[PDB]
């Protein structure tokens, strides 16, 4: 299946090379897999989610995404136009308030909620979690991402937008999860992207067009937008029976476009998330 004049990020993850604008992907499109977006929530009622999105848990007055971040990250995961996995189920978990911040205790509850809640959802194809959030190192948060991962959920976390080594950010520094750096359309590492041995993969991160609240659309940059891409890709690859939750990260890193990116620090992996789809 080809989606012409697709956002550059989608087009790129179906491409050996930059500069193309068609997104190629198996028409299965992550159907029957579930991506839990742990973020500010999801405007489920956005025409772009086609009913496939729902808020499953909040730690605040409203499960409504007043911020947008989560709706935008959910969009890049499984929105019809902007999503990688156009047929995946998206499960909003609002750990972040409408100011886009959240206590580490809350976030941890959210990761643990998903580990359990997946046993309450139909995901024959397998479960993904897209942690487009981060902050200072915290072994507690790291352990929570590890647990989620262990629980049989592919976890994709942002490296962080600090242009520093991601060893010093959580859950970015957790070994067991898929730490995602960000690239731009010209295959450069996004200026803001965190790096370091801990990173597993890059994903489109700069000027990522995706769904926004008030049923709208807008481009925003950040490793936070790379992550949904890779989460999405994991949902697409699990539905194709090409990988499992446990090994998805490895499988994405094996099948990635190698050496393509410029401005990658020595000892950071030069791997760009590829769907490795042949039409
Ligand atoms: Ca674009
Ligand atoms: Ca976002």
UniProtKB/Swiss-Prot annotation:
Its EC number is 3.4.21.64. The active site is at 39 (charge relay system), 69 (charge relay system), 224 (charge relay system). One of its GO terms (cellular component) is extracellular region. GO terms for biological process: proteolysis. Disulfide bonds join 34-123, 178-249. Ca(2+) 1 binds at residues 175, 177, 200. It catalyses: Hydrolysis of keratin, and of other proteins with subtilisin-like specificity. Hydrolyzes peptide amides. This is Proteinase K. It comes from Parengyodontium album (Tritirachium album). The gene is PROK.
């Amino acid at each position: 299946a080809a989606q012409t004049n697709a956002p550059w990020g989608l087009a790129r993850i179906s491409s050996t090379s930059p500069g193309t604008s068609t997104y190629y992907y198996d028409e299965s499109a992550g159907q029957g897999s579930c991506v839990y977006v742990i973020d500010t929530g999801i405007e489920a009622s956005h025409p772009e989610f086609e009913g496939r999105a729902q808020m499953v848990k909040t730690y605040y007055y409203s499960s409504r995404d007043g911020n947008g971040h989560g709706t935008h990250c959910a969009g890049t995961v499984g929105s019809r136009t902007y999503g990688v996995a156009k047929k995946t189920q998206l499960f909003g978990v609002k750990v972040l308030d409408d100011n886009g911040s959240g206590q580490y205790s809350t976030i941890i509850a959210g990761m643990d909620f998903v580990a359990s809640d997946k046993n309450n959802r139909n995901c024959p194809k397998g479960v993904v979690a897209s942690l487009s959030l981060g902050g200072g190192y915290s072994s507690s948060v790291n352990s929570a991402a590890a647990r989620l991962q262990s629980s049989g959920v592919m976890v994709a976390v942002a490296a962080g937008n600090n242009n520093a080594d991601a060893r010093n950010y959580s859950p970015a520094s957790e070994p067991s999860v898929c730490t995602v750096g960000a690239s731009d359309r010209y295959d450069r590492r996004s200026s803001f992207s965190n790096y370091g041995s801990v990173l597993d993969i890059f994903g489109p991160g700069t000027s990522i067009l995706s769904t926004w609240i008030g049923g709208s659309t807008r481009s925003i940059s950040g490793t936070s937008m790379a992550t949904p891409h890779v989460a999405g890709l994991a949902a697409y690859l699990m539905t194709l029976g090409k990988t499992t939750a446990a090994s998805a990260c490895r499988y994405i890193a094996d099948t990635a476009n190698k050496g393509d990116l410029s401005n990658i620090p020595f000892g950071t992996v030069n791997l760009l998330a590829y769907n490795n789809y042949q039409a």
